[PDB]
Amino acid sequence: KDLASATNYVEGNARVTSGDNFKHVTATTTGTVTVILSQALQSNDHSLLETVLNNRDERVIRDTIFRLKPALAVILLERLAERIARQTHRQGPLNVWVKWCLIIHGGYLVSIPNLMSTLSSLHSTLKRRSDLLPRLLALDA
Amino acid sequence: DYVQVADGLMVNKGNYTLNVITKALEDTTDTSNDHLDNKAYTGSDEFLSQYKIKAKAKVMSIKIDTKNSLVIAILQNGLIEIFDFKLTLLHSFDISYDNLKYAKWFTENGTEYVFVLCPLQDDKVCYKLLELTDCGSGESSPIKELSSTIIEGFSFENSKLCYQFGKLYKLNQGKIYIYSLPHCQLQQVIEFPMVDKLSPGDDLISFQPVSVNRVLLTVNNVIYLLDLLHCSTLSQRELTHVVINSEKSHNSKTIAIGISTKNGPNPTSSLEIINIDVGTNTLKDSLGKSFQVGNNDSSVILKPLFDDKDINDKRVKCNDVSGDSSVPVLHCNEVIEKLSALQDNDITSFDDIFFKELKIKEEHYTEKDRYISDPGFLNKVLDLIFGKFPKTLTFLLTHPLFPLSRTRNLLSLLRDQPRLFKQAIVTCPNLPLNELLEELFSIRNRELLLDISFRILQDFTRDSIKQEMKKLSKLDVQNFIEFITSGSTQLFQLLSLVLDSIGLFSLEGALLENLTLYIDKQVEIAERNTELWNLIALPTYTMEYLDI
């Protein structure tokens, strides 16, 4: 090419991200599905993760998360943040599952030291889904 | 350049051992050791020894005495080994090493023949050096360095009789002319106020510094450029600086001549024969976080006045960018006279403090950037006005309009005037979060709440705010929320801060439902006002008329 020819900008295969990925730093309740969820989260099981959360009865969700262990509740939040990051039409019945496990396991994930870092997928999911609010406020105005 | 200061033989071991370090003791027969216990037999003691080492196994140690040679001692099984003599004066400072590392017939007089670590091991006699008063062993490429008051300096390695360097270095009889922390240089600690680190590879001085305080016996530790030094007429032992992966905290080196501080670790509790208490608990020399603690070796602070770009044909200023004044001339003798002018007979008036300070700061009394000042002077004159006399109108209004108040701000809640406290909010550029919080939660339902919320939300970081407003009662936040419901924006986000700091569970029901009702009406009206802000052909047969 010429020597007076200016070099054109090209992105190539460069990684684009945001300033919000902080990836570094006797029975009497219901017959629920929580052993399904715990042995889904011990493995990484998308098929029976989807069969344990296509159910959207809110009280079965509630006592499912209550009967769930605290040690894998955080990784439940991670899987939920990933999938509502991917499918935006899944934000309806699945932020139910995230507004409960924040509520139900209150002390465990306020004792965990970097909630923003270990749930930066959730940080980035909500910050992206909620930073564009004033634009569509102006739109529907 | 000091360090974290407090507390006022195998030398790399720890406790739980029987006897890892043996030393000669004053006013006894010869010697002893310490525990955390073994035998201390006769290794041909009872001489005029003062210094001690071992053969680096704790099984074949040596009682280095005035015999000109030594033997192997018995403190592990009892069984002795065989010996030999080379020199014949005093082996009282012998340093026995590992398997052919550094061992030579250095008795007292510069007659060291080369040898090795066995009973009859020997080699070619390198006694052609000077009778040096500072002869020592180092381990860079294992060597002996010898500097003399016959003035001389030399360096010869104990590997192949490898004499590498030799010159004349005229060091005096200083306090400690000992090798440094990494051993590349030799710190000669001079007696009274001085210590010079000289580069021990070419006989050249590298840093001749002064000393900070009094100190007698020092020891360079396992550090970069750091030693620990204790005083002669005191038990004061500080640390100075000019293993590097996980720092050496205790029992790396020991030489101490204070009040019997022998075997000096950080916890130097288990002394040789003393069995006394301990002291400081630091690590070794870290990277750069010891700098604000050890801000010593110069305590000569004074008042720096504002200098200039100095005048040489400085009448050619060429449209100076100032407003109207051309040169502010600093009269600091007049400012020191204004201190004595403020210390005068206006005990409740404003003619011998107020107009005096307004005349020594000549402006419109509500404006800064007419600066000719010093913060220490201003703190002193602020105390001379907060002494015998806050009724002043000019000086104590024109200088809490000053960015340098230096924590004289504690009674800004204790004084309660309308205008002086409103100015103390909106102007005083140091006003801590404790009293901001108390004036935030001592509501009489006024606008000083709004102006103090603006200050606490513009001046401090949210984590420092929230860990401090942990420390509040419940009824102050209850009358706060009842105020916000009954009788606003920074207040809204400060309600968010208060609610985040209040904790997670232990709240009440009707108060939360009250805030819920209020906050949902706030959301609906915020939606509609943001909506307001964002909210700002022919037919085939007609019939008209024409004019007549």
Add this chain to the structure above:
Amino acid sequence: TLKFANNSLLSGIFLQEEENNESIVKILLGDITVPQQAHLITVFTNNGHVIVLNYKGKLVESPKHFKISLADEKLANVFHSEGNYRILTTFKHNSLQSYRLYALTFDDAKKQFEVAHQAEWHNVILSNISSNGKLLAHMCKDVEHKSISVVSLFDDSVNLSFPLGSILSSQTQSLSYNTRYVSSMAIDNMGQQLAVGFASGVISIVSLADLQIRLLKWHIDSVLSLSFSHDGSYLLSGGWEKVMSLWQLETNSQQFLPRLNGIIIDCQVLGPQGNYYSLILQMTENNSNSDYQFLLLNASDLTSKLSINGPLPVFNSTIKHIQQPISAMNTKNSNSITSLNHSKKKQSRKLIKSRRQDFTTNVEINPINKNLYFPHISAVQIFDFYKNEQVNYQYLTSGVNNSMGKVRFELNLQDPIITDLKFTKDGQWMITYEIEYPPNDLLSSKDLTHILKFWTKNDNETNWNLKTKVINPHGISVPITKILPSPRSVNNSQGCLTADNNGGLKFWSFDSHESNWCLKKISLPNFNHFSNSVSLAWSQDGSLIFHGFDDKLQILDFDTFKKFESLENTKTVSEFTLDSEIQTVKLINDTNLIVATRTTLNAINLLRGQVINSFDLYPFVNGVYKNGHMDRLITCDERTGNIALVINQQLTDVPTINYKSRIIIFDSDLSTKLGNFTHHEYISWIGWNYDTDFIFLDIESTLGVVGTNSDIFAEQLHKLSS
């Protein structure tokens, strides 16, 4: 190269701190002292000096220079042909100059060229000369309107005069003044056709035999440059779109050269057989300066043979009688057909009356090969100053910077502005931050986007491969008021520290396990106050950070990225509030650090946790710099001193246009002024190139430094083989 300041032989013509309007105005290849003998050129300057210079071999100890006697004129250009020589000059109500042609002779006494005064025209709007210098056309403006006249200046072969209402169309006298405003003209060598390119965009070839016009319409915006070929069969044309078109005038067929990275303001064919085309590109992206890239190219394959470019900085505002060129409309990258006199008057009053004499730039040095990177608008000019010629040019943002020539309404956009770029200390990464501006008249016209990018290259090549780009660093709609590379300890110099204007910091560094440049650490305070007086420093241990927000020079750790707090509280001063908004927190060695605010300049030791020395800055930087430009004003070394750099607007007997620069170096914490120097012109940037020197950039962009039978047969055979 023959430098003006390298000899007193012609630096006596100009060295002045104010009176430097003296300019070289013509270069001739022969010799005017003696004919027939050429390896040396005669430069005519605009006052009357005729300097015979040599460029073959070594420059002599004395030029052959003369100085012609004149009246009060100003030597517009010279004209040269067989034997004869003419010369053109300008005069003195309506503000228009007047031209006057003389002839030159030399024969009698060898200091004086006798002029002869052929012709005069008492008002001239526009002038042009044929490519051989055989005729010149001009405008005259006698009243109802203007008039165009062709004269031949070496013989009386052609002269004619006619009103341009007879040129112009009859449909255009109900149209705008863009459709009547001749912005360029040209003639052929025979005087048979004259090209008039207007400001609306069309060209009109009148035939000078009888005044019949042929219209050529391609330029959608104003026409700025025209020329005819030597035979008069081709017409070079150039305007605001950066497309050099050449018109085949038989069948009206254009050949285009479409992306010239500068608008064309002159084009002419050059060789005998027309093999080269010399062009001038005005490079209108930065409106802070008029910077011209000179370019010839050969007509064969239209490749740029020998493009010529200076250093290309972008100042904060316009400098000294710098006018962006004419166009059809007024925009931010041009000025209109009318608003030229208005905006030269307004910019003259902005220079005299206003307060902000702030003309500073940011420039970096690559620490590997010491070439300096001038960040242009959405681009970089990599320029190495050991031989003062540009390495290359690289667009760094996703604009329409090159993929479209910008014209009338779409000139009202601007590219992303490269506001920060910094090298990592190993020279292997280049960090760049630029602000994407949106276009107007739509919903998202209010919110800028902020883009931070990390680029790398191996040392051989000359362009930079992007590796990753974070958009919205520090969150949405927030700027980065200062970026900082790391010292070589924390990641082998592969770390960066970015500062908001809400006091927030972020630490971005390279990892290899995830092969990218990602985010490690964060400190986010959300105050409700904002201020762009943010500054930064880093300790060479990689241990403590010095975050100079407004009035708050905080000290942060690097273990947990928070405020420096020690449990023993041994006066561990983690805060130095100063008197005003700080703009420089420049650390010189690990011991102490030199701070500068808009009022004073302090030095503070940290192995002695208090202040040491002070100087005033209020009578020098009062508000005459933007809050954030003192770091590109003044700099330091890694070991041995720092450099203050102040500016005095020189005044008459009200301040005036001209400036002088007073630089002063102190060494080792503000002790002694060991260097006090004054240079003739406003200075914009100083920095420490990495071999214990400091380089500066002027306002006329000159880089400077402060530092420590046989031979008879042989000659006859080499002359016969020449």
Add this chain to the structure above:
Amino acid sequence: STARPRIITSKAPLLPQQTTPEQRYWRQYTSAQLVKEHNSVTHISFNPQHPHDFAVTSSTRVQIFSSRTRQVIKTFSRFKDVVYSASFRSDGKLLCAGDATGLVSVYDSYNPRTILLSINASTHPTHVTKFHTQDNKILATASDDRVTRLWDISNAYEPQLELTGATDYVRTLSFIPAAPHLVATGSYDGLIRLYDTRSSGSTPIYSLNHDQPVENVIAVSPTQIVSCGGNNFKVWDLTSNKKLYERGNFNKAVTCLDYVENFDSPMQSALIASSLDGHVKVFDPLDNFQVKFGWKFSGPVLSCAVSPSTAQGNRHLVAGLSSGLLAIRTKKKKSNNFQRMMRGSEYQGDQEHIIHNDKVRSQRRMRAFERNINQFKWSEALDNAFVPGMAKELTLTVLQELRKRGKVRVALYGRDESTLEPLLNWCLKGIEDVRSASIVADWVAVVLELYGNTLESSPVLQELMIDLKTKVRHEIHKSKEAQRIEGMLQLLT
């Protein structure tokens, strides 16, 4: 002059659970063939040398499938109980099969009719038989007699070593790949015992304490082995005698393991493991044995293998389930007078002094939107944007190039009711996603700003605007309640 720079596609910031190159490479193993065997598929091995066949052990028959057509080429039926193990020799020239009567029959591969020899091993079922990997004439057979055996296949009457010392049901062999004296056997009491064969052989030289009963043990490097049993596999340095990794990322017991090295893959080496629960998963032994991909089949996956490091053809992954069936996933790889006239076109200049090269390398073909933008047809660029099968980031990137480059109103001048419907019909779907919603916002803003009277006249787009308003209301409800969840996560700081 310059080449005109391309139109850049609009890449918005990346999202979690993106495609790593390792899972891209593994995910292109497709076309899963199923084969219904009769019984539970206990073992499966591959040919080593030209590694293009794999032997599958169903009950009482061993089927060599081929890796060009994935069907059975050869079959071994003449067993007398359930056949257990089937393995090819290191050269691929012969095949050993352990039986439930203790009769290790070795045939030659690619000829099922010549039983080369038949070892009458111990009376209990022999369960694992394989040849040495370094040697070629000793065969290790371990049985339900708690003793493994090294037979010499010349002397198949008495074993050349009889590795005793176990306490429960030896089921796995391996050999150490550099030292060929070292046999790492594994039994149902944890305890990966391993033997130097120069010594007595009744005593292992050291014992690696897996807790759970091991089901498989392979050797990865010359120095580290991987043993699986229970829910976890544990990797063991042999020299340091030390467990140094463990993964228990499965639900049920890990049945089997194998390992590939330096094959054509972004993952330099791979350990895949099969674990009784449907899942077979691949772990990367370079970045600390992290999982990178996994498959799920319709039963308990009982044995798995992949085609070896020098397969050089169709690359296979087979998993045989206990249900009785098998799943295979693959990745697949004029005249003499005229020529003598037109001869030299293949030359490229070896002996030639100078070589010139100015032929421009022909780039990618510009799409319709890009060439319309390059010719400055902006309304036509929009028309070409809103074709049916167009990629969503391509529609987004031409909306961004029209918005940034020029003027949306200029692109939107000559419209009417039928030529505005594609824009808003895309805006309905495009106001959902976050990558597109702001650009859809200011595009619809200017189109209502320019076409207000058609909202009066044309009723074909009135309900289009209504349904757009409904979708904006939906997504502003989600974009407020996500801010609520962000606040109640900020409270948990």
Add this chain to the structure above:
RNA sequence: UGCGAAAGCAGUGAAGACAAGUGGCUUGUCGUUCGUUAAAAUGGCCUCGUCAAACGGUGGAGAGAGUCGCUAGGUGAUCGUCAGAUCUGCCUAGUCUCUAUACAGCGUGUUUAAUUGACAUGGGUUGAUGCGUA
């Protein structure tokens, strides 16, 4: 224009000349001046080689087809007082199954990784009035 943050807070004339329309009047303009910190002349961007098949990294709303199989909804025609029927009502979204990751983009000249193969890159006559598979 000034100041500031990316929000915003303060503030916006006279002469001269010319033309047009009706010496005067009226408006508009200015390659004329003083002061204030102060949209348009049908007119748009070059060739140098295309095509096919791989390979390496980067992203993906996946590119598309199904199963009235689950889960949440949204809604319609006619009848019928409602209860409720017939369309085995329609659509959306999530799930379930699949396929050449089908999708998009950047490179493979030398790079951290990754490319080969066709072709006479002409001239001539149709090719648009020769087509129905709607």
